[PDB]
Amino acid sequence: KVFQWFGSNESGAEFGSQNLPGVEGKDYIWPDPNTIDTLISKGMNIFRVPFMMERLVPNSMTGSPDPNYLADLIATVNAITQKGAYAVVDPHNYGRYYNSIISSPSDFQTFWKTVASQFASNPLVIFDTNNQYHDMDQTLVLNLNQAAIDGIRSAGATSQYIFVEGNSWTGAWTWTNVNDNMKSLTDPSDKIIYEMHQFLDSDGSGTSATCVSSTIGQERITSATQWLRANGKKGIIGEFAGGANDVCETAITGMLDYMAQNTDVWTGAIWWAAGPWWGDYIFSMEPDNGIAYQQILPILTPYL
Secondary structure, three states: OOOOEEEEEEOOOOOOOOOOOOOEOOOEOOOOHHHHHHHHHOOOOEEEEEEOHHHHOOOOOOOOOOHHHHHHHHHHHHHHHOOOOEEEEEEOOOOEEOOEEOOOHHHHHHHHHHHHHOOOOOOOEEEEOOOOOOOOOHHHHHHHHHHHHHHHHHOOOOOOOEEEEOOOOOEOOOHHHHOHHHHHOOOOOOOEEEEEEEEOOOOOOOOOOOOOOOOHHHHHOHHHHHHHHHOOOOEEEEEEEOOOOHHHHHHHHHHHHHHHOOOOOEEEEEEEEEOOOOOOOOOOOOOOOOHHHHHOHHHHHHHO
């Protein structure tokens, strides 16, 4: 393997985010361990599992978990880690809980102690503080990431990596513009990884199959790479994608080839996304018929 980690998001448990609690099998679904196994057989060793904070811990983030949703999170994590791969536990929440900005680091720390306690003995779990903080106070984003770390380590979950995320939708291309204060995060286990996301369409939203140019990915990560190096930090690309076309194929490999020459800071990359409810989605990595599984995975083989 070229990178420490290379794999895919396994999306579904966060679907239908407007329906809370929502109903499993109707509004959301958990990943399929059999198709995860296929991706593992292809060489992937990390799987990021989005879920909603409100579905895992309803009403108040300081309360008790929902038994049903937690049981399925547990089963998904174990399906990944029992094979030897890493499972990223991702509260896919944008820094918000019931659609309000999480303004209490203390409440967030308690949420994270609750979650980390369920996984504290599993060294292949990775805790991801929150997906894509955005449009909120920059000091608060720093403090929420630190509160998550403190809660996780307080639970005795000390072996695991922690993926921290920044503002501006944790974008790599925007990182130095807004997220410099993230350099001050502390972890007694010294296992912080800075998770950045990078899409390749014009606005970086990852909603169009069209990429700006054949070099846009490598261009959009250069300053983030320099920031990680200058500050003595390590990073991962926790979401990236491009359409099944020639320009995007080239942009994807150019980005990954650049990361491969900068592994002093880059630990790897995670595609967005696999999962069982993507259908004809332009970026679907879901075996055996997702568009990216068929048409993009062949160009990712060099990194597996």
